Amino acid sequence: HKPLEVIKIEDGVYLHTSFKNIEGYGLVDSNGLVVLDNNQAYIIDTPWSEEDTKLLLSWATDRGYQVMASISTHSHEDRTAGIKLLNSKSIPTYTSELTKKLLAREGKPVPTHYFKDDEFTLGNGLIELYYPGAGHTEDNIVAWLPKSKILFGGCLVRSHEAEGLGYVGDASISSWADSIKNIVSKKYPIQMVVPGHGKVGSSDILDHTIDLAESASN
Amino acid sequence: KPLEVIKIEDGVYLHTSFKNIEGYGLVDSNGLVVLDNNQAYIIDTPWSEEDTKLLLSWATDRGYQVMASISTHSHEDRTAGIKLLNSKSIPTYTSELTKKLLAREGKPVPTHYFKDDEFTLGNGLIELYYPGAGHTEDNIVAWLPKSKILFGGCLVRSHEAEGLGYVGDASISSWADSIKNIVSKKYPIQMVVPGHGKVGSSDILDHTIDLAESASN
Ligand SMILES: [Zn+2]
Ligand SMILES: [Zn+2]
Numbered sequence: 001h002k003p004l005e006v007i008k009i010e011d012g013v014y015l016h017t018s019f020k021n022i023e024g025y026g027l028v029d030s031n032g033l034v035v036l037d038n039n040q041a042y043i044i045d046t047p048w049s050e051e052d053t054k055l056l057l058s059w060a061t062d063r064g065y066q067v068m069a070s071i072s073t074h075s076h077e078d079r080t081a082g083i084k085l086l087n088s089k090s091i092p093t094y095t096s097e098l099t100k101k102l103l104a105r106e107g108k109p110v111p112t113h114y115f116k117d118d119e120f121t122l123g124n125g126l127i128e129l130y131y132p133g134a135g136h137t138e139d140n141i142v143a144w145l146p147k148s149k150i151l152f153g154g155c156l157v158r159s160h161e162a163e164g165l166g167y168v169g170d171a172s173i174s175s176w177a178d179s180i181k182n183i184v185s186k187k188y189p190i191q192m193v194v195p196g197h198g199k200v201g202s203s204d205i206l207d208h209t210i211d212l213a214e215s216a217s218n
Numbered sequence: 219k220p221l222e223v224i225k226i227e228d229g230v231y232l233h234t235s236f237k238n239i240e241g242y243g244l245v246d247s248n249g250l251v252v253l254d255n256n257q258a259y260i261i262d263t264p265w266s267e268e269d270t271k272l273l274l275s276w277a278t279d280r281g282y283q284v285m286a287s288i289s290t291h292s293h294e295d296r297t298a299g300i301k302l303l304n305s306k307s308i309p310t311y312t313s314e315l316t317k318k319l320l321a322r323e324g325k326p327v328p329t330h331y332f333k334d335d336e337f338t339l340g341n342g343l344i345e346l347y348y349p350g351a352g353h354t355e356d357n358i359v360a361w362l363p364k365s366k367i368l369f370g371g372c373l374v375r376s377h378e379a380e381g382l383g384y385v386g387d388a389s390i391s392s393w394a395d396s397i398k399n400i401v402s403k404k405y406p407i408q409m410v411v412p413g414h415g416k417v418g419s420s421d422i423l424d425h426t427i428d429l430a431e432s433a434s435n
Contacts, residue, residue: 197241
């Protein structure tokens with residue numbers, strides 16, 4: 001597959017995108033973020049593979065950044081593949097309590113840290129994490145970046161160009177619209193929503209996602 | 219999600235296996251089981267060794283003898299059902315080119331292989347043909363004279379497909395020429411089975427040319 005791409009999307013916020021070859025279908029992209037605070041770096045979702053995680057770490061360290069932590073937004077592999085490698089480098093890895101326990105139940109590498117409430121911050125205010133309820137998975141969380149006004153929605157949100165909800169084998173479809181409404185209730189002054197797959201868009205990505213969820217729910 | 223097998227004609231069964239793609243949804247992949255009396259031939263295996271196991275179980279529970287498999291190209295998916303069949307002493311066939319491509323990539327290799335651009339399997343049951351590069355450099359197709367079905371694998375796209383699929387190893391500018399070589403065989407095609415998506419008519423070929431020429435620009 002083609003290798004990790006990293007592109008600046010705001011002052012101190014970079015989009016990292018990994019790619020998978022899907023036989024029969026084509027190339028599929030997966031997004032996360034790197035957030036900088038002076039020379040400290042925080043990774044929101046790892047890349048989709050251990051080797052693209054290695055490239056992400058090298059991106060940061062070649063720039064003289066110290067990688068302080070990762071947070072993964074649910075237990076699925078496009079969010080967590082790199083937890084094994086970061087653990088091996090002694091980089092703190094974080095999920096929610098629920099995500100950590102799901103990983104453990106499945107015999108997957110676990111983060112070295114977790115948070116218990118519906119809200120938590122990383123980087124002492126830099127990244128606000130929120131659990132809005134089930135949708136894409138029972139455990140999906142979102143990250144709000146108050147300085148850049150970026151909401152990282154992960155797979156709980158769908159890009160404009162997405163006509164469906166994606167992989168729903170672990171989804172709670174009938175809960176999903178309510179969980180997006182919970183995000184809206186936070187009154188974040190969102191100017192960009194970053195989905196787990198596809199292109200970055202505005203806050204109207206939330207309304208789009210509600211439409212898809214309500215349609216599927218029937 | 220587990221294997222599905224369904225009859226699409228007397229003696230011909232469609233097997234469809236599924237992958238969970240984690241930002242897109244479920245992706246299906248097709249192959250065939252072709253019967254001559256109780257003797258069964260597999261055209262492409264499920265992309266999983268675990269689904270191939272189930273396809274073999276499907277055949278032998280019905281009391282069929284699995285005579286051979288044929289693989290249409292060297293991609294990770296439709297092979298290493300090769301590994302499994304090899305282990306059960308079931309002959310596995312590919313083109314010689316496909317065989318060497320696998321061997322070069324250190325993948326499991328078929329025990330059997332054919333040299334020319336044409337080969338017939340099962341006493342006239344299955345006709346294999348190499349039309350040129352397209353989805354891949356080595357892709358072959360299988361023609362079934364009895365049922366008048368062409369298995370196009372990923373060289374052909376379903377009527378519903380809007381793109382050529384995974385094009386990483388494609389010869390896009392060679393692709394329309396290769397479909398043309400299939401048309402040039404003048405097979406009395408009643409159906410075409412794509413590697414992905416719904417089975418359809420011979421117009422699936424024209425559709426594929428249209429995607430290929432379009433892409434070529
Ligand atoms: Zn997921
Ligand atoms: Zn292929």
